[PDB]
Design a protein around this nucleic acid. Structure first.
Length: 75
RNA sequence: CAUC
């Protein structure tokens, strides 16, 4: 819910489409942030990002820790 | 739905 950062750039460490989640390493802090499938903006569809992709996102405080939201391409 |  609470927004912790906007317009953050990061690289997908891994994203597993069977479990519907993965992690993004933030470029500004080098910390991993959790990314759930629901947090990825709209892309025969499978909501997902690829290992090694650079993405742009917001960081919010979730129940179990910091997580990415509004995940998109960097433009 | 927290390291596949």
């Amino acid at each position: 819910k609470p927004v912790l950062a906007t317009k953050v750039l990061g690289t997908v460490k891994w994203f597993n489409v069977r479990n519907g989640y993965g992690f993004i390493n933030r470029n500004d802090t080098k910390e991993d942030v959790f990314v759930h499938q629901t947090a990825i903006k709209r892309n025969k569809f499978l909501r997902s990002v690829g290992d090694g992709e650079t993405v742009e996102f917001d960081v919010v405080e979730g129940e179990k820790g910091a997580e990415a939201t509004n995940v998109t391409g960097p433009g």
